[PDB]
Design a protein around this ligand. Structure first.
Ligand SMILES: [Zn+2]
Ligand SMILES: [Zn+2]
Ligand SMILES: [Zn+2]
Lengths: 69, 45, 56, 42, 309, 49, 49
């Protein structure tokens, strides 16, 4: 639902690169392959962590809050 | 005593055993029990 | 068999009634009582028997 | 003659509900089933 | 007046009476909570059986005859014919026939299952009594339905019941009073009424009346406050609750400026327009006390929006 | 991992691999058994229940 | 030490199915019995045999 904090296989921290990855795709006009390498994700265990992630949090945030303060 | 929340207008209500189950503001008939105010412990594993 | 089975006994004149254990009265929530199907049929037999007895 | 009693809406309402609530298509079996929601593909 | 035939579980060793007993459903054991001694084993839980309610039908076990995977119409017809010719079941069939008609009447008005259950129960309790022997069956059924609706806090009006069941008001009123007396008589013998049993209970009518007119829920709440405070005026307190509710609704209709004329409000609710306007004059002099303070304070409704004569 | 078994990385499990939420719903109604008998939602006491 | 054989190694899409052992494991030493046959009841949820 949200970007994992650590790579499942080797434990590298990948939860602080989601926004950078999206920025590279949008503003830098880079393909997903080049963006992953620029972020320092070399082992393919880490690449699939960011490459195949589905951000379902955005869909959930569209619903109005159940309890508003 | 108990504070309930409407499921359509998010209005916090206070109902007794005699009060009818319904929102007094918008008229909805679905109410969500409010989150407990007591702290709950969780393990980060 | 002269003692264990005779043709006259194959016709029912007196019907034995099984005890409640054979036909227990189950309960769903303990506030509603249900009766075994045998009890339902046995009650019909009693009603029919009394109806016939009164008729003739 | 009371039109409100001549027309019994319960007949249509229950007949459709019963045939849809259960699989008994009458008054065939398994015509209606609880939708499977384990996953989107299901 | 009969054999005891009662089993009480007490611990022989502890001998404390009453004993502390814990029923371990999972382990199927009844054990003394003090010494741990097991008092009884192999406890049973608490298809092949049918559950029936012995409050509307009492004790009456019967079985129908119908076609099977293989059956000839000759046997079914004659067997059904024989079943009908029974003297014991005839007495109860009249009560059962009454329940069937009540269910049809209740189901034709779109009422909850609780009402028909209450209505059927009321009929059974008041049936087979010497007092109810000269009244038409239609009056009895209508009175039971009205009682059933009252017990469910969804009480209808006399006119609403008279729309389906046709019985003149004189018999309807007399039957209802007799029926209420019967309930009171059997309530002391062994409850039956509460604050809802009160005849007026005007607050219950407002939600349905406004719904028929299609007004928003905000208007309904204002009308409820107006009707509740409407009982402080002696000139209106003695009026019929229907008129009190309708006139109160009419005051709120004009307060919120809904384009619905009185000619249609009285046509839909079957209330004379003159009565609505006649009651408005009495209700117009106490407008300041008949408007919710919070609604006026917020600014949604102002007392200057109500036309004055 | 013989005969259709598998070996799974415990560290991967710790990091959230194949972890899931489970939701179960319990329904209960306030039954009205006829007229006299009726139910309510209450916290029964050991002295009155 | 190096494994004498080389291992086929790569990513693959796996799925977690609904069957979890904690929803199947159950044992019974003694427990409730049926009303009619007076034998152990049926069903894991009811501590059956
Ligand atoms: Zn990695
Ligand atoms: Zn609301
Ligand atoms: Zn003991």
């Amino acid at each position: 639902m949200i970007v994992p904090v650590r790579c499942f296989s080797c434990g590298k921290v990948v939860g602080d690169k989601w926004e950078s990855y999206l920025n590279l795709l949008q503003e830098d006009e880079l393909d997903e392959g080049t963006a992953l390498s620029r972020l320092g994700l070399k082992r393919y265990c880490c690449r699939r962590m960011i490459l195949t992630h589905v951000d379902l949090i955005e869909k959930f945030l569209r619903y109005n809050p159940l309890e508003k303060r | 005593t108990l504070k309930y929340i409407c499921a359509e207008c998010s209005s916090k209500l206070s109902l007794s055993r005699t009060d009818a189950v319904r929102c007094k503001d918008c008229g909805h008939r679905i109410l969500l029990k409010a989150r407990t105010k007591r702290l709950v412990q969780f393990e980060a594993r | 068999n002269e003692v264990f089975s005779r043709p006259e006994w194959m016709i029912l004149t007196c019907l034995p009634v099984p005890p409640p254990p054979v036909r227990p009265s189950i309960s769903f929530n303990e506030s509603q009582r249900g009766e075994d199907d045998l009890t339902f049929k046995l009650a019909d037999i009693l009603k029919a028997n009394i109806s016939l007895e009164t008729l003739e | 003659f009371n039109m409100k009693l001549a027309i019994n809406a319960k007949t249509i309402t229950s007949g459709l509900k019963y045939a849809l609530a259960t699989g008994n298509w009458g008054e065939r079996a398994g015509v209606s089933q609880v939708l499977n929601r384990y996953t989107y593909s299901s | 007046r009969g054999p005891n035939l009662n089993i009480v579980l007490t611990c022989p060793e502890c001998k404390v009476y009453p004993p502390k007993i814990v029923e371990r459903f999972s382990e199927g054991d009844v054990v003394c909570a003090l010494c741990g001694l097991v008092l009884s084993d192999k406890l049973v839980d608490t298809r092949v059986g049918e559950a029936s309610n012995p409050l509307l039908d009492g004790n009456n076990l019967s079985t129908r005859i119908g076609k099977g995977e293989t059956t000839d119409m000759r046997f079914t017809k004659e067997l059904n014919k024989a079943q009908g010719k029974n003297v014991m079941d005839k007495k109860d069939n009249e009560v059962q026939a009454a329940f069937a008609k009540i269910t049809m009447l209740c189901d034709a008005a779109e009422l909850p299952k609780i009402v028909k259950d209450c209505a059927k129960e009321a009929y059974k309790l008041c049936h087979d009594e010497k007092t109810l022997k000269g009244k038409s069956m239609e009056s009895i059924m209508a009175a039971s339905i009205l009682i059933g609706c009252r017990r469910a806090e969804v009480a209808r009006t006399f006119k609403e019941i008279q729309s389906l069941i046709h019985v003149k008001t004189k018999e309807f009123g007399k039957t209802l009073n007799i029926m209420k007396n019967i309930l009171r008589g059997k309530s002391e013998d062994g409850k039956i009424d509460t604050d809802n049993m009160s005849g007026a209970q005007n607050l219950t009518y407002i939600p349905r009346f406004c719904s028929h007119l299609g007004l928003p829920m905000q208007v309904t709440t204002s009308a409820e406050y107006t009707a509740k405070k409407c009982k402080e005026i002696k000139e209106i307190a003695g009026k019929s609750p229907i008129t009190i509710a309708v006139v109160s609704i009419y005051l709120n209709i004009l307060l919120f400026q809904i384009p619905i004329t009185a000619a249609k409000v009285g046509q839909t609710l079957q209330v004379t327009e003159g009565t609505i306007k006649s009651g408005y004059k009495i209700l117009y002099e106490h407008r300041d006390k008949l408007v919710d303070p919070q609604l006026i304070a917020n600014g949604v409704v102002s007392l200057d929006n109500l036309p004055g004569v | 991992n013989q005969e259709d078994s598998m070996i799974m990385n415990q560290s991967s499990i710790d990091r959230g691999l194949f972890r899931s939420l489970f939701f179960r719903s319990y329904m209960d109604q306030e039954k009205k058994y006829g007229m006299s008998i009726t139910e309510t939602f209450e916290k029964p006491q050991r002295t009155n229940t | 030490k190096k494994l004498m054989a080389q291992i086929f190694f790569g990513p693959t899409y796996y799925q977690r199915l609904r069957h979890m052992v904690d929803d199947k494991i159950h044992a019974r030493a003694r427990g409730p019995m049926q009303v009619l046959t007076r034998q152990p009841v049926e069903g894991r949820s009811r501590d059956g045999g």
